[PDB]
Specification:
It catalyses: (3Z)-phycoerythrobilin + 2 oxidized 2[4Fe-4S]-[ferredoxin] = biliverdin IXalpha + 2 reduced 2[4Fe-4S]-[ferredoxin] + 4 H(+). This is Phycoerythrobilin synthase. Keywords: Oxidoreductase. GO terms for molecular function: cobalt ion binding; oxidoreductase activity, acting on the CH-CH group of donors, iron-sulfur protein as acceptor. The structure is a monomer. The protein has a single domain, classed as oxygen-dependent coproporphyrinogen oxidase (3-Layer(aba) Sandwich). It is 27% helix and 29% strand. The chain contains five helices and seven strands; from the N terminus they run H-E-E-E-E-E-E-E-H-H-H-H. Strands 1-2-3-4-5-6-7 form a seven-stranded antiparallel beta sheet, sandwiched between helices. Strand 2 and strand 3 form a beta hairpin. Helix 1 runs parallel beside helix 2 and helix 4 packs across helix 5. The protein starts with a helix and ends with a helix. The structure holds biliverdine IX alpha.
């Protein structure tokens, strides 16, 4: 199992409509069975274009990367999460409302802020004033679970109060173009699963509305 199960459960507790509509990849790779496992899922449901759910695990790594893309028409942000356990004393937890409009600073008043000193992501470009990043230990991940449920409640609120119905995937063009520029997914998958698979995972699954 995953250290992440309590995040994963809270996610689909808040959004019970997100049913798997395509299992994009179940892949084995890494060291030889294969010791690296990818589950790539796409989920649909009321008020969403998609939720794309990547989950990679090997003996050392445990990575859950999931973006909720809502239907367009209501200027709504995505909700993105990168739950990354690299070693057994190194985890990084990332979650934010990620707005499709470039250069623009989105926020939700009441929520942790941020500043925003965090190095790998740029506040105000597809990351909000309330971007949540922490570094911690595997055994202490659930300390931030309630904060997580607070972001989910707020995001649920804004979906429910706007109820978008548009399907204009080009709204997310700039966003997914930007996110494809992030490292290291491309190379991590390259090594672990091969070039064809890394290319497809990134361009056809993770960030496919470029
Ligand atoms: C989805 C698959 C996925 C994989 C396979 C992955 C692997 C991964 N991400 C890392 C760091 C990191 N990865 C990210 C973020 C990302 N990096 C990305 O490739 C993407 C798409 C994001 C975010 C949406 C960040 C912010 C770090 C910083 C680590 C640090 O604190 O130094 C590292 C440590 C080594 C390094 O920084 O080069 C690995 C192995 N991260 C992932 O999200």
């Amino acid at each position: 199992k995953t250290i992440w199960q309590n995040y994963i459960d809270a996610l689909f507790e808040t959004f019970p409509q997100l049913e798997i509509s395509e299992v994009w990849a179940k892949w084995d790779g890494g060291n030889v069975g294969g010791d690296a496992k990818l589950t790539a899922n796409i989920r649909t449901g009321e008020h969403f274009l998609k939720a794309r759910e990547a989950h990679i695990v090997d003996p050392n790594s445990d990575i859950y990367n999931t973006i909720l893309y809502p239907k367009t028409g209501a200027d709504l942000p995505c909700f993105g999460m990168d739950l990354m356990k690299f070693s057994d004393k190194k985890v990084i937890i990332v979650f934010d409302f990620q707005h499709p409009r470039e250069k623009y600073l989105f926020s939700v008043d009441g929520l942790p802020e941020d500043d925003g000193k965090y190095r790998f992501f740029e506040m105000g470009n597809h990351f909000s004033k309330n971007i949540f990043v922490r570094y911690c230990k595997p055994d202490e991940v659930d300390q931030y679970l309630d904060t997580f449920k607070l972001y989910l409640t707020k995001y649920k609120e804004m979906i429910d109060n706007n109820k978008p119905v548009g399907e204009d995937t080009t709204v997310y063009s700039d966003f997914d173009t930007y996110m494809t520029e992030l490292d290291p997914v491309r190379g991590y998958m390259k090594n672990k699963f091969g070039e064809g698979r890394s290319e497809a995972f990134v361009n056809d699954f993770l960030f496919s509305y470029k």
